[PDB]
Design a protein around this nucleic acid. Structure first.
Lengths: 49, 49, 49, 16
RNA sequence: CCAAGUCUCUU
RNA sequence: GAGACUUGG
């Protein structure tokens, strides 16, 4: 597809993941696009170890 | 845990599970309402088993 | 059990407590899987046997 | 198949 | 029969 | 190590 391994990493993550993973990481990106790291404080919960 | 003001809570479920999960969450919210109101109205003088 | 029940107590709780906005993120759930998944499943089955 | 399906850009955090 | 977490307690 | 406990399957 391309040689830029950074955007390629983004692209493969978007493509080599289930719609659940894609959607979660999508929401994660849009919720904290360019806010101050200090201003944000978030948790993510998952089931299995 | 989202104890701050304007806190945002996020959930992820499959499309096929949408009706089941939303009905379950309504069960949960109505259970919260039920426990709250039943505790409020229920008045017991003995206050001890 | 005991708890606060008055509205002034309710708002006092809201001073340190918060009812975060609860939202949903639905995603399309598919059932198809890739071939390499089948290959790795076969490999792990051979290992188990 | 060699391909997973994408998901649109337009989702909104529908109130639940 | 499977996960999670917990706890006492093993490395 | 032994398990134990809670929850669920």
């Amino acid at each position: 597809d391309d040689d830029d391994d950074n955007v390629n990493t983004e692209e493969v993550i978007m493509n080599f993941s289930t719609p659940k993973v894609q959607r979660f990481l999508m929401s994660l990106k849009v919720s904290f696009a360019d806010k101050d790291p200090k201003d944000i404080c978030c948790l993510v919960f998952v089931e299995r170890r | 845990r989202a104890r701050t003001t304007e806190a945002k809570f996020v959930l992820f479920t499959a499309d096929k599970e949408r009706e089941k999960t939303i009905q379950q969450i309504y069960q949960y919210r109505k259970a919260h309402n039920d426990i709250a109101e039943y505790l409020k109205d229920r008045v017991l003088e003995k206050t001890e088993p | 059990i005991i708890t606060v029940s008055d509205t002034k107590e309710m708002e006092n709780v809201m001073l340190y407590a918060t009812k975060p906005t609860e939202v949903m993120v639905s995603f399309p759930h598919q059932e198809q899987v890739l071939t390499v998944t089948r290959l790795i499943s076969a490999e792990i089955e051979k290992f188990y046997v | 198949i060699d391909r997973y399906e994408q998901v649109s850009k337009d989702f909104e955090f529908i109130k639940i």
